[PDB]
Amino acid sequence: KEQNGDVKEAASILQELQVETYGSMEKKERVEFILEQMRLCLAVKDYIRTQIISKKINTKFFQEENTEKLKLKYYNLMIQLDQHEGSYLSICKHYRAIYDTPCIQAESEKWQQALKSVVLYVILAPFDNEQSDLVHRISGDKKLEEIPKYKDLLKLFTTMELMRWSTLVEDYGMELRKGSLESPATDVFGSTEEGEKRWKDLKNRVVEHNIRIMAKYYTRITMKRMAQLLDLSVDESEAFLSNLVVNKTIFAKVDRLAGIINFQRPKDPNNLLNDWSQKLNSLMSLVNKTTHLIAKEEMIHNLQ
Amino acid sequence: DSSIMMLTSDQKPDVMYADIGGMDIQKQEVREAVELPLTHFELYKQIGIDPPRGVLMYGPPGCGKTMLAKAVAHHTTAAFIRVVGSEFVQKYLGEGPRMVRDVFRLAKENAPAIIFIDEIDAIATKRFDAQTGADREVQRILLELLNQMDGFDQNVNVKVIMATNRADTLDPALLRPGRLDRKIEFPLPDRRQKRLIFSTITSKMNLSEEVDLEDYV
Amino acid sequence: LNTPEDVQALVSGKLALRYAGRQTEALKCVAQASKNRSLADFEKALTDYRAELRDDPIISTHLAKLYDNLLEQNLIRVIEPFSRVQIEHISSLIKLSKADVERKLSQM
Amino acid sequence: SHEDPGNVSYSEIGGLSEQIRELREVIELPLTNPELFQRVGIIPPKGCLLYGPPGTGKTLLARAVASQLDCNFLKVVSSSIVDKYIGESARLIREMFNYARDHQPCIIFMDEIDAIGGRRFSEGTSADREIQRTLMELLNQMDGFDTLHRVKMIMATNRP
Amino acid sequence: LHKNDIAINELMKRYCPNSVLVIIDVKPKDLGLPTEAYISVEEVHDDGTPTSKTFEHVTSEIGAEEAEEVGVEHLLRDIKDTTVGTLSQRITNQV
Amino acid sequence: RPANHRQLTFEEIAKSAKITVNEVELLVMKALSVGLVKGSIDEVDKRVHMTWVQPRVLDLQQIKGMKDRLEFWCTDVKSMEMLVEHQAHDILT
Prior knowledge:
This is part of a larger assembly, with chains A, B, C, D, E and F. Helices cover 28% and strands 11% of the residues of chain B. Chain B is α/β, with parallel strands linked by helices. A 5-stranded parallel sheet of chain B has the order 2-3-4-1-5, sandwiched between helices. The longest helix of chain B has 13 residues, at 95-107. The N and C termini of chain B lie far apart (46 Å). Chain E has helices at 5-15, 72-76, 88-94; strands at residues 37-40, 55-58. A two-stranded antiparallel ribbon of chain E has the order 1-2. The two termini of chain E are 26 Å apart. By secondary structure, chain F is mainly alpha-helical.
């Protein structure tokens, strides 16, 4: 409080944390004091000092059940800690722990920004199983689908609507203008920092999603028509597909001499399932056609 | 079955051959005794050597006896069996015979089985019960051990090794060349294996950047 | 040994700084070139100090760091081909050294 | 196993100076965080020996923090390993550990390390290596060769 | 099938809800398959009548049980299991 | 269209679809995402590839397809099954 502290005041309190843990019985005073050195070491700019002291934070469990919403209200401070130094799967539990204070506050402003901060981070999360059910867990809010950007956001989630990226840039660059609510748009888009890497993460998502659905929908395709149908440039697809091959999880194929490129099976090594599919699948359905067309013969021969 | 059975399934002892600190005496000779004759058997053929029966390692307790044995178990090739000498002795004054029955029939039941016997106590069990103070008991299980030491086949590929610092309840007929031939006694420390082992133990602890360890060599 | 951090820390040692000179400059430049695996830096500061480079008769360790790095470089450059590949696909994807840094890949 | 009672306070008699703090380090803190020891790479503190007087540092004043912690507090009075079919000793060592490591940070507690009814003789006739091989297979399945997942040994005796 | 089928369907459903009747033949010289199985559900129609309990068909099949051919396969004696390669599949082909 | 042409052009698509030459890729990839057909289109020449589909009846009461394919196939595999019998005449022996 003298000079609003510094690193050397923080250097006092960091050795004055490890002593003051285990002497007496305490649950809450260390939490509502434990906020202080974490908002110090976020301003010490290191963020691995923040993760060292986060390794000091996480070792205290049973932090729910503090009576009269006392640390549920501290959850705004714990997310204020874990805002920057949390990656895009840390933001999932982060932005679902954001809901606990507006859970009973009903709050048509801070629960409204709880709605927007719980809607605007699913795309930020990578392509994983947790995306695949978090899109169904954002399914279940009541006034979030009143926001048409939730309709746009669920519209991005199943083949993403083969579109122009800048139209979605319109629809989601309106959100920094939108309302008094601006901080989810700050955290995702209105940042000249990690949020600009979230802009480029949305770039990653749109070209990566063109890969995700079109790598199913490829038989033969030209190079530059792809490159301009990826909502981006032609020669820039050199780097913009070298990243998608250090993605290294799609086996692919390209030709630069003729442009005919292709994402497909490893070049028909096993010819069997053509025979198996046709004969077994369809023609055993056809030998079932005997078994159930005599049944439908009995259907029509009810009245015949 | 052998202590569970035949290098009890999943257990690497997780002591690296590289984790051993410069034992160019120990590693080379133990390699020649056990790790080599499984591989280059035709050189033993081509020179007609009749390879050695079993190394007798000893020395100070903690210069890498059990470490080296468990490290050969870590980097084994054949059917190793980990055996502690008296973890399963069952007051049969002469269960060492049933041990060697397991050895025989399980080394030819498996691939040749390499069996190290740790904590050599298998002569002196706890229900010594005869006339004088286990003179003829310890002596009878020693001479019994000798009886199932002289006639394996010279060709039953079982590597037998002993490691304690106590050859006093052990018969000095076990030191006749032909049975426990290889004499190796380990150095206590020495110089430059302080360098080697001071380097190797720091493979995981994270070394605060100038706190050096040549001073301690 | 492939521990370049300790090469840095032990040219930073006190007796290395007691008997410093030019062969330690060769060791430090080759050390940083191995620390960052820059093959151009490696070959460059290799050729710069040839009179001190003879005193290691094992240039095979050096050209094997070249070679044994170039293995996994052509591994990450034999899987990178099927995304958007360029001029020859078999000659000059290899970091465009001059045009003919190979007879190495083809030699392998 | 689970006849094991507890104390109605941490201070059932008194004298908790090193007791609370050092027993707290030897049990509870690396079970909360193994990565601190994984800056070094070693298992958790291999366990003190509560020796001293028979009854202020032997069986009483042993369950102070145990009352507070309540994780895997079993009893081993170490007479149950000296068996009938004498190789059931090591089998019941397996039955001790392979039943213990469920409550995952385990409390290996052993009052009266060498306990059977009566007194003990010396290094002559049969007051012998029962204890040594039994105790080395104990130490075998305690640490050294075989253990798993932040199990805390606690030895507590002065009788043997 | 006939019209009384739905009446004994009405009474067979009150004993078991998912009941199933069996159309048989007394002399199957068939392809062949053995006797039939239905399923009685209510789909009523596109017509708007009171409830139509029209007989839907269950695909019928046959299982097996230990010790139930002991004398019968002994009497036939014409049992030929392992000959697939000349006849047992050309019968299926023809069929 | 009377198949055996399944890998085909694009101008009939851009003519019957009342769409242009350019907007057939949106067409085919969105129509695959709908779920009435599942064939991965040869996109390099705008060449169609198709799968399972939903019918709207054949020749006016299905005369022609039924006869000339179904009964033609009937006598095909029936008579060549008789030929299987003819060469397999006494291999049952």
